[PDB]
Amino acid sequence: RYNGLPSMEILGQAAPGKSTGEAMELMEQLASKLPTGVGYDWTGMSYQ
Amino acid sequence: DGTMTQEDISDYVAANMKDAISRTSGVGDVQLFGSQYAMRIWMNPNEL
Numbered sequence: 001r002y003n004g005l006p007s008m009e010i011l012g013q014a015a016p017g018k019s020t021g022e023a024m025e026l027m028e029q030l031a032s033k034l035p036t037g038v039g040y041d042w043t044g045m046s047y048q
Numbered sequence: 049d050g051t052m053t054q055e056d057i058s059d060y061v062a063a064n065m066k067d068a069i070s071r072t073s074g075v076g077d078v079q080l081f082g083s084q085y086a087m088r089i090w091m092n093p094n095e096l
Contacts, residue, residue, distance in 0.1 A: 004067045 002041060009043070020046075058082025 001007055014023035024046060031040040052060070062084030070078040 003071065 002043065055082065055085070059085040 002009075010027075012023070012027070014020045024042070028040070031038075058080065059082075061082060062080050066078055066080055066084075069075060
């Protein structure tokens, strides 16, 4: 659970050449095209 | 759209909104103007 709600932590890293900002931007885009009632958030290093 | 009653809204606010809002940056105390849904067992003393 993350912030009281049920969750699943997903880890990954930016591909060779690409930055973390570019990588995180695509994860947001892919997360938007998920089923109804499925949100997301950034934690740990991705929060800071 | 008159799909949710007064207490239907209160349940959603209590269950989905209140907890997340109560942990928000700078929020002190959160008073729900309503009540979260409980399993109400309305006893009938004649049948009882």
